[PDB]
Design a protein around this ligand. Structure first.
Ligand SMILES: Nc1ncnc2c1ncn2[C@@H]1O[C@H](CSCC[C@H](N)C(=O)O)[C@@H](O)[C@H]1O
Ligand code: NA
Lengths: 265, 265
């Protein structure tokens, strides 16, 4: 009679919370999805060993189209868990799943875990200064989407930071690197010419948040566009004007050039 | 000879991640602060029991003025942990403490935990749609903070949601309720008269996120301003333009007036 939405956290199998783990262990059935994102520092087998439960993986279709036929029926007479990377209900379409549960007469509870939305705080950028967020998608065929560029423009104009999710092909295990994101934005800039993203724009790259050894790099596009930030996934952030304390952190912790202490403050 | 910034999470001692617990258990010294937020479902005793260590609680003054004299010295010959509610770097100035650690020649690591910043996902409002955030601070003497009003205005003009962290006076054991925040906002509206926050404004209240039964309520200020949302902590949210599915969730899960289902595109 109960469905638990449990977050797996940021990077590896130890990023789930104590509460999430213990609840998952008490559930009769455990489902999970890895299409919104993947857990780069672990594997399905490792997650299964930790929880001590067989984990049934669901595709995007399984969830978006058949959540009520796959998961909810079992939640009617059993305790069921639905695992997702990060914090549950962060992914745009997930909240609606709770409405589906309600409609099926199924109780649902949310067990939180770390999300990249809050983990980006490790970049030293103040959380309150983040504006609307967006996702950088690849142009394809006769389609060249550029809304993420406008998001950066509107946030920066108001002195706000912009966190950018990069394209991911979960099934194909293909990720867009920060380097690729930068090249794309420069391309959009050449077309838009709004002076939003150029070789002189200061950016921050965050890779493997959650790991004990994440990669946090800050610098101008001209110098970072060909740098190696390691394995994906990568998060690209275009900061708005910096508070001196944010700049100092980027210099001391993210290897930013001293230059930002005068140029971007 | 290392320092760990470990978040304890949203509500109780089990909101810590497995990673954080296992690391906290093996630290020689454990410090913590409980002035940046409130963990309404646990006690220092329960936290110490879980980690199996005596915890030295520090005041805002101990940290802000003496972190380098109290904590860092021990981090040179021992493994030390600094625990905080929620995520250690979210809506705190703790990130700067990493600079102090570095300058003191002490390596530091950050272990994230669920944060209220991402926990807002449980309100059904798309997290990417949140704009600049703000804090509603208690007026003091002749000083009456009002900047948070302009933040709501700026975001609303852009159709973005506004998350409002609420004030806290740990030493006085005072935690601002959503009701108090609404009263303060109405007073600011009277002064500025920008039509930003009135009795007809739709707001969402999230209380005690992290608990199994948090209070999630949506409605007009006139109807919620005197409603009991249970014990603190609380956060107040002023949504911007709603997507149909956001309104549906607010009605089905947050008990919002069915009339908001009819969005004015
Ligand atoms: N469980 C919870 N439920 C509702 N609001 C919460 C909350 N935890 C924190 N807050 C809100 O955030 C304020 C503290 S700001 C510090 C936030 C913390 N670092 C984190 O990561 O969550 C509180 O005064 C309150 O308004
Ligand atoms: Na945000």
């Amino acid at each position: 009679m109960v469905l638990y939405f449990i977050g797996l956290g940021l990077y590896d199998e130890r990023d789930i919370t104590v509460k999430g783990l213990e609840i998952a262990k008490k559930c009769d059935y455990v489902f999970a999805e890895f299409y919104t994102s993947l857990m780069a520092g672990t594997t399905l087998g490792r997650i299964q060993k930790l929880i001590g439960k067989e984990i049934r993986v669901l595709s995007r279709e399984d969830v978006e189209l058949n959540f009520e036929n796959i998961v909810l029926p079992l939640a009617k007479e059993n305790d069921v868990a639905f695992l997702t990377p990060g914090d549950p209900l962060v992914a745009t379409t997930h909240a609606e799943l709770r409405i589906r549960a309600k409609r099926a007469g199924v109780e649902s509870y949310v067990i939180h875990a770390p999300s990249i939305y809050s983990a980006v705080g490790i970049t030293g950028l103040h959380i309150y200064k983040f504006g609307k967020s967006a996702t950088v998608a690849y142009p394809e065929g006769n389609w060249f989407p550029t809304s993420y560029y406008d998001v950066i423009k509107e946030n920066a104009e108001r002195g706000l930071h912009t966190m950018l999710f990069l394209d991911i092909k979960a099934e194909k295990r293909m990720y867009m690197t920060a380097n690729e994101a930068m090249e794309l934005l420069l391309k959009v800039e050449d077309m838009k010419k709004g002076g939003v993203f150029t070789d002189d724009t200061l950016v921050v790259v965050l890779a493997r948040a959650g790991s004990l050894n994440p990669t946090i790099r800050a610098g101008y596009v001209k110098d970072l566009i060909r740098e190696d930030f390691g394995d994906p996934p990568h998060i690209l952030i275009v900061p708005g004007k910096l508070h001196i304390v944010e700049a100092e952190y980027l210099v001391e912790i993210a290897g930013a050039p001293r230059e930002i202490l005068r140029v971007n403050v």
